[model samples]
Target: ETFQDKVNFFQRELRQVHMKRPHSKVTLKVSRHALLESSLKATRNFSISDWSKNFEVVFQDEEALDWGGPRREWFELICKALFDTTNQLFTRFSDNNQALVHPNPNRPAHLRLKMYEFAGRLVGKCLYESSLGGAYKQLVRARFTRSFLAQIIGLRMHYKYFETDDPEFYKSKVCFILNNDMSEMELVFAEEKYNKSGQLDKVVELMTGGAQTPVTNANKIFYLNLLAQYRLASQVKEEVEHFLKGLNELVPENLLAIFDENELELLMCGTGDISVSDFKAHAVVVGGSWHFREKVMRWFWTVVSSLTQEELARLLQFTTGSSQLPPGGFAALCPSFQIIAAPTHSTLPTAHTCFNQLCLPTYDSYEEVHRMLQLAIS
Candidate 1:
């Protein structure tokens, strides 16, 4: 807009936790729609520096701790617990011969006996080392998600998506490649978009109109495209948010149970000054930490774009087979079979199966999914 406008924007944008680069924040507004601009600013350009500082100012009444303080440690510990829980689930499913369990009245699946503890410890270790000892929470979370997706799709589902094993290698190779490639892709895209073409990364600047590295812009674009094309009616944001809320609620007490009354008192709490936008902004910043979200989105788009309809159909046939699948699977595959079967057969079996497998809510209606999503986003 104006010199001062640009300067002000750059300074504020740089402070956004979601910003990938500080230098490119001024030039992002040349092209793009208002919504695109808004999404970019609200979600991606959030500054963690500002977040920490604002959190301090807003929660001034609460005692503050140094970095890696107890509250931070508590957050870290909960993350660890979640990681371990998922790991346990992966191990149990990995070794299980079938989905049955012993006739114990107390336990249904016998997960305790079947699931191994820390079997997938390497998943955590590799991620930790790769992300520099988990200092980058966003990256760490993304890695966790990648492992989660890989565990569920690669290990747990047992390659049901393919009639042959080709998809397995494709997924493995694709995700692996993306994980490595994106490291450089970040630089290349940035250079191409910003340096060569004079493009600004969306989040690097404003809600829109800025250019940064093409690669980071591509990442955001890729992520948006993946979400926009989601076969399911519900958005990934909605699903994930719902899942997180339930997860948070389910384990409302700190998972470690170490936040005794004194420690709990010190943990940061939202003050009236912490506006709703602040929370949403922080969510975007927090969300960006996970590399897998982008990768997973890329993986889906990659498979979707690469495969022929016939090939995709054949693959869907493999995953769905005769039985109904969970909505997530249905959303991913969009199996034509479900639409055809909806008129004749019941969606119950599929719903139940999905509920058990993907932790989707069990409901007679699809509205429940939307309801969960609504609560999650709020």
Candidate 2:
């Protein structure tokens, strides 16, 4: 008899008939995993043991002979991390996002597919609720990851070029214009005195006639430049220079507390301590773009839990002092140039700058803005 027919007959007849043998009940329990396997097999009219042949038929790319070694390993990890994670979080219905705030009163059978689906939905919901800082928090994390990645890759313009290195990477921030090929020197001074959105925004406004770059490629490159440049300015203001001027000296400090172990571990990992060499390397991987570094800085600052907010502010002051600007108004002079930062390992927060000063006339046409951005990215 077919497996399905036997199972059906057993359920209908044997389930009701009392056992004549020593055991009164033949209670059978299956694991959730086993249940899932059986359900999938029965639904698809096949078994997992036959997966290889089925795979070859349906997925030509997954054939055994094709990409069998390192490529396969890479694809496997990518599939597990990206695809599996996605499936678990969404489709499998056993996603972590749906964790229940309270315990369930009834303990259902593990074999119930409905229970696993509900469990995953509960986990997903919980994760979503816990991560409710919204888009702002996401953007902040993105900024930090980008900047740090760029530093690790050594893309800053000030640094010598290497495999992933470039001269223009270091000083792409709006403030870096002080020494870069962007605009008149006075643009930095003008923004310090006149604008609140900061050097990066002003630079972008000047270039794109108030048009900020959208994150989409379907949009013009100039607009993207405007967006990146604006973010660069935004990050420098909030993360570096603003604190340097003793703006929030009284706020509690919370700088990242780095243990000596962390230093050793980093060295072991091939990226040494917080030296310029290390940071520059980190910068290149994050697109080595001016905008990307800003994000990295944000991430680093967020982890500064050892120092209070105010101490972190003061830490920036030391860097500002190097420029002979009063610690209070030093940020006022940062032109919207891109490359800058102060590196220190002793629980100190470092500061950065802005360098543009001249404002641009609004472009006469959208074509002009589009042309400028293409030139910048290229």
Candidate 3:
């Protein structure tokens, strides 16, 4: 039998059977470590007969099972076993399936959902108990690398639990795990933001306005990265405005205003052309302040590098006072480019451009826009 069947059968037996001998009715207790060891063995072996015997030895009856104590250690033991076995079942299934390049088309979705539901109940119980929170938090903070946080979320999505279509569902289970505790929730958020696994976007997907705001420095940095990464301007528009509102002091002056016609022309191609002296002159014009020329130039390049292809192209269209370019129209000009006289190498020159302020033109054919940018010192 599978581990799921073994556990379910064992659990059912615990509720249904009575010990035959009066000696078996004597109340007994087992240490948490002993129970955990039995659980691990059962999960590893895919057979719970020994674990079921262990459970029967430890309790006179289901009602007599101790969940309360000075340390609530018994409760923790039960929770840990439940959590581990659930994780193991999923792990076993994953290992068996990994070798199949194309998954068995006959794999049953309902069976997958059953495992998730079974696991979710145990996970939810742990989350429900304040005493169990620390243990539960460790599992989450570590992301249970054996089973993966994604597998659970994917299972939920397959079952159509929550708003699965929205990316926000990615963190729905995580949000539930934190139980709306802002201090602890924000701590996890900050960790994910800087984590090498790039899970910040997953955690940020949970952000809802009001008290759940990403208020920390790490939080803001993740959100900033998200804004620059996605081309869905309308989708993230509210978040951008809300973030900027809180970070007003940190925002560059006239940052939004820079999208206007003359400002965009100055920012994109700069003031002068190929000449060395003229390049410095161009920098001064685009830099916003001659006093902080070097700083302004650095800031400009930072902003330029942050924009995605679609964002830059849309901004360019805004500057030209033209109807927005369709997604395909600006494909060539919108990629990341550099402002250097020569290419980095023969192969790389194809991607660089030379600058010229006069290249900014009235809306004409898309090819004109292409030529205008192609003639630049990128």
Clashes of each: 32, 92, 10
Segments of candidate 2 deviating more than 4 angstroms: 1-166, 169-184, 188-378
Q: Write the per-residue lDDT of candidate 1 for residues 1-378, one digit (tens) a residue.
A: 322243234324323422332222221221112322232333244342222221111121234454334324333333333333333332211122211111111222533421122212212222222222224231111112221232222222222212111223324533343455454444321111244667653323221323343434336444332322221112122333333333232122233133221111111110012122221222211122133234322332343345443333323222232121222233333212221112211122122111122112223333433343233222
Backbone clash total for model 1 is 32
What is the C-alpha lDDT profile of model 3 across 89-115, one tens digit per residue? 322212321110111223334333333
- Residue 228: error of model 2 in Å? 8.2
Worst 10 residues of 3 by lDDT: 138-147
Model 1 spans with C-alpha error above 4 angstroms: 1-67, 86-92, 95-378
lDDT of 2 by residue, 1-378 (tens): 332343244223321232221221111122223333332333243221121111211122233354224222332332232223233311211222111011121223332333333222222222121233222111000001122222222223222111011112334532253234432322221121245655344332424333332223232333334434333333333222222222112111111111121121121121211223322332322122343245434433333333332232322222221111221232332332123332311222222321211111223243443343223212
- Runs with alpha carbons beyond 4 Å of true place in candidate 3: 1-67, 82-87, 92-115, 131-143, 146-378
- CA lDDT of every candidate: 0.26, 0.25, 0.29
In model 1, which range of ten residues has the least summed lDDT?
263-272
Ranking by lDDT: 3, 1, 2
User: Judged by lDDT, which candidate is best?
Assistant: 3
- Write down the worst ten-residue block by lDDT for model 2: 136-145
Estimated TM-score for each candidate: 0.19, 0.18, 0.19
